Amino acid sequence: HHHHHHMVHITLDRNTANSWLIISKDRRQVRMGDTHQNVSDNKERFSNYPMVLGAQRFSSGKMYWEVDVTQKEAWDLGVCRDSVQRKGQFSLSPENGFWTIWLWQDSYEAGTSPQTTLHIQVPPCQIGIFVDYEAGVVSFYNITDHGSLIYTFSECVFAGPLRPFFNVGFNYSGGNAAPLKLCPL
Numbered sequence: 001h002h003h004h005h006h007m008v009h010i011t012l013d014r015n016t017a018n019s020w021l022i023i024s025k026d027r028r029q030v031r032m033g034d035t036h037q038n039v040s041d042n043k044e045r046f047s048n049y050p051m052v053l054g055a056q057r058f059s060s061g062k063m064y065w066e067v068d069v070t071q072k073e074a075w076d077l078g079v080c081r082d083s084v085q086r087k088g089q090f091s092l093s094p095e096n097g098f099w100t101i102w103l104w105q106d107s108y109e110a111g112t113s114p115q116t117t118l119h120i121q122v123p124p125c126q127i128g129i130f131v132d133y134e135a136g137v138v139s140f141y142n143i144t145d146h147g148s149l150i151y152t153f154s155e156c157v158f159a160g161p162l163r164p165f166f167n168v169g170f171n172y173s174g175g176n177a178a179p180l181k182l183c184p185l
């Protein structure tokens with residue numbers, strides 16, 4: 001790719017975080033805590049899963065950011081509608097307003113309905129996410145493998161403003177405590 005020159009400074013929105021997440025002072029890192037984090041509930045918070053949104057809202061243009069997934073067993077990354085469901089159980093699909101990929105149990109998959117198998121030669125330590133609002137495109141790039149394409153959603157029905165989306169995953173195993181980190185441009 002050559003998408004680095006549409007780079008945007010993403011920060012995490014504390015108010016949308018699941019109440020077990022810990023967001024760094026600079027709002028660039030998030031991890032799963034071992035307990036509920038002494039914050040009030042609100043209607044924005046994701047209740048069932050360890051999810052958080054970016055503070056930035058996008059309704060036009062080309063946006064690019066990179067996330068460090070080093071030493072994680074499980075995560076979800078991408079973008080979602082500002083209007084996505086926050087409470088109870090839901091699937092990650094374009095029908096529900098999510099354009100995402102994930103790692104789960106040693107397999108990488110795109111959040112289609114049903115999910116699509118990804119083919120990645122070099123397990124990524126850093127992921128690039130590119131959104132072209134006008135084109136209706138969300139693409140994922142493997143920064144560890146010279147920016148090689150992972151997956152492209154096209155003809156996307158954004159149907160409103162978009163927010164960066166993150167899931168740090170559960171830590172039942174004790175092997176998934178590592179943070180998601182937004183990487184410097």
Ligand SMILES: C[C@]1(O)C[C@@H](Nc2ncccc2F)C1
Binds near residue numbers: 031177178179
């Ligand atoms: C228990 C902790 O607070 C330390 C750990 N941090 C990291 N672990 C793995 C890769 C990168 C990290 F920054 C989460």
